Amino acid sequence: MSEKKRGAGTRKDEVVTREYTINLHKRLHGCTFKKKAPNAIKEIRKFAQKAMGTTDIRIDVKLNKAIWTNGIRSVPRRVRVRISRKRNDEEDAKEELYSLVTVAEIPAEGLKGLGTKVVE
Amino acid sequence: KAGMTHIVREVEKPGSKLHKKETCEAVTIIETPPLVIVGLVAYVKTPRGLRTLNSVWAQHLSEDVRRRFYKNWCKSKKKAFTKYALKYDSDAGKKEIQLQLEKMKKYATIVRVIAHTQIRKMKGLKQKKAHLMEIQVNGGTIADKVDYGYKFFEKEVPVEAVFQKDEMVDIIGVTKGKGYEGVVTRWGVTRLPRKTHRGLRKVACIGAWHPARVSYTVARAGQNGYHHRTEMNKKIYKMGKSGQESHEACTEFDRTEKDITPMGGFPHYGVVKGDYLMIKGCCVGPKKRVVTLRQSLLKQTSRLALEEIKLKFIDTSSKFGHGRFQTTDEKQKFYGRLKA
RNA sequence: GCCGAAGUGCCGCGGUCGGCCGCCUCGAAGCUCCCUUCCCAACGGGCGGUGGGCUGAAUCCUUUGCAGACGACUUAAAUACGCGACGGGGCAUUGUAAGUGGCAGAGUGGCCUUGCUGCCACGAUCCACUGAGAUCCAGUCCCCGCGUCGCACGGAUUCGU
């Protein structure tokens, strides 16, 4: 899914992946407890939409489990999410990661190598 | 309006029981950058009130008008456009300026200045957009003042050159927008009192039967905040700037050096690291809104302060268990280090 | 050059040029054909001929929070002192985590090699490591760390005296 560039800025590539930490803690506090978890998942779709510039995101059921396990009224503050951007169809795919607790850093460079492996 | 801080000043009076000694005071801190005066405008008084005859624009505008332009004009600096007139033919434009001098000096024009606020000298305030405005010029004879005014647009004007310390200055701004608010917080009416009641925050009756028309004077809901307001007679305690106007403080008893921003910065404004102006008490507006200071119309003074009242404490508060810059911050950081 | 106003018009010069029964002529005073105002000024506009010149703005989606019921206000982004999520550091909050060690610990079991360091567990809880851990911009602050968007926008649209 076309991260295309021509004449303008870094990155002459299409599909890659990057791991970014997704902010649930904003806007969500303004939202009701009753609608808190379905609002929370919608935030994730919005961030992907802006970043890629593409409307179509499908979000994995594994990601849905992570948000909703705490409940409708309790949502985690942030979750690290992997955002991949693949297909001829042009869909964005998001999934869970793992970390105990630590830091956000330079995952992206290693993930370029990961994206190459999907190909060949 | 940057926010508000506090200052402690050691009074002096005799009428009431307690007087003299330290007193807490609220003070508004305002960032007041030096402002780029663009033009000398000739307004002649008419029996319909003042009428401009022409407006003069500086000889070299190319960044000033280009930051100004997302209101003032529109579009947020995209494709190199939004157009202002380019500087005239060399001796044609100079002749035009001096043609104005003749007109001014025959009817004795009330000299005025168009200036603009260069907010681009500030960084913490997220707006980059200069506000064009009219500030009147006051002084002597018409010939001298106009002549000076031409030379005066070719250079900034600082805080120290417009207000003297101690002065009573009327401060005028537009209040914080609250939104739409009830009768109770718009006119200051009572709640209607009952155990339960089909209207609580309400007025009961809005007129009488025979005048078939609701008065303008009766209290009902509507917008509140974002209103022009004048709040008078504010003592200008201190004018200064970070590094190269003011020092900071004089050490030991006077006070120890404390930057006028609170540590962690002003909530929802930004961090002050520039000009500052201490104006008495509360000031209209939220934070990140234009506030204008304009000299008191009642030049009388009389006795409120009169005498100056040496700055002791600033309360630029870094507290709730610590604080007062540098050393105390280091003490807290000592209980950190490798995860703080 | 003046009148600043609501000057936007007035006054002066000099040729050029039209008009001038101002003055003198020609055929001529007949060209709306023997009552039917029969349109005739010019403030303005329309429309051609030809001599120049002006080389764009605005609006949508998006964004800010300065702002908001929704428009709107007020910021930002199309190639730049440009801009964005995290992290790091500051700032805050609360109060000292997980894990590990301990004649810390009311005590109690159970095996003997029967213990002036007896060992193995159990044990609310306490302490050390640990003013720690967790959270911290959303309407906190900063960065020149890290990667991208940043399509040198084309995607969507409107306007002429």
Place this chain on the structure above:
RNA sequence: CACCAAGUGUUGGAUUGUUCACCCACCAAUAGGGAACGUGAGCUGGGUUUAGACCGUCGUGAGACAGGUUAGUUUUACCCU
């Protein structure tokens, strides 16, 4: 005591449905009047003023009472100004 003057104030409680009333107490002052007896799609519903009911009086009785006493549904604005 009289004048110009509504510019600006003119009160809290106790009790009574009572405004009125009458006290307490402050005070510079605790003026008086009107606006469908201002003010119920703003309220409350305590009074007046329904249907239940008690008592007294009057009435052969049913009932009545400018006599007392209690409990008793407060609808609709989104239209136009």
Place this chain on the structure above:
RNA sequence: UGAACAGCCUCUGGCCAAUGGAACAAUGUAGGCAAGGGAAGUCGGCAAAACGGAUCCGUAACUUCGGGAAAAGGAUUGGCU
């Protein structure tokens, strides 16, 4: 858990259909909390609110001696060993 066929949580059985999305303004409706004061509010404590379970202690003028009585009023209440 606890007296509980109370409430709350869950098993087993049964739904996931209560038009959905966005902002989440005033104003409502429904639910909470408020320093200091404490019914001064109001026709009236209307309901909010507090008390509340139990064990122990303590218990009134009065009374048809059966009661009032859980009078009032206090103290106590864990984890674990």
Place this chain on the structure above:
RNA sequence: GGAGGGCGCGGCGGCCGAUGCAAAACCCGGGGCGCGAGCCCGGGCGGAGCGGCCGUCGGUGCAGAUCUUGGUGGUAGUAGCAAAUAUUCAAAUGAGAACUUUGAAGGCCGAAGAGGAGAAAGGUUCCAUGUGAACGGCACUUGCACAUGGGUAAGCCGAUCC
């Protein structure tokens, strides 16, 4: 309020006319007449019977009646569609899927249940298959809808018997 003189409609006796080569009806910011009631004529639409005049006769002329019956506005695309703790993600299918169906997930009733059944009641609603014209005040390929089929078997259970 009376009397007077007329006009229009329906039908009947008389009398005369008109017609599929276009009657009646209906439409017409088209003409003209009469003070009016009304009339006349043209054009357009239409397709089978009709009108004038003289007598006769009425269930004979409308603006209403908190009118009757039918139609249609503004209201208004406005109030609203807000109780019942709650949805979400991926796949399947299909033209089209927040709602169907399957999984995953989150929940909810919380065993005096939103449960498994019988009474009473309804009467085929049960289930398959077909399937979106109406209807499920959203949607919809789904339905307790519509269409098409099938299904209830008793010496011991009930009625019966008393």
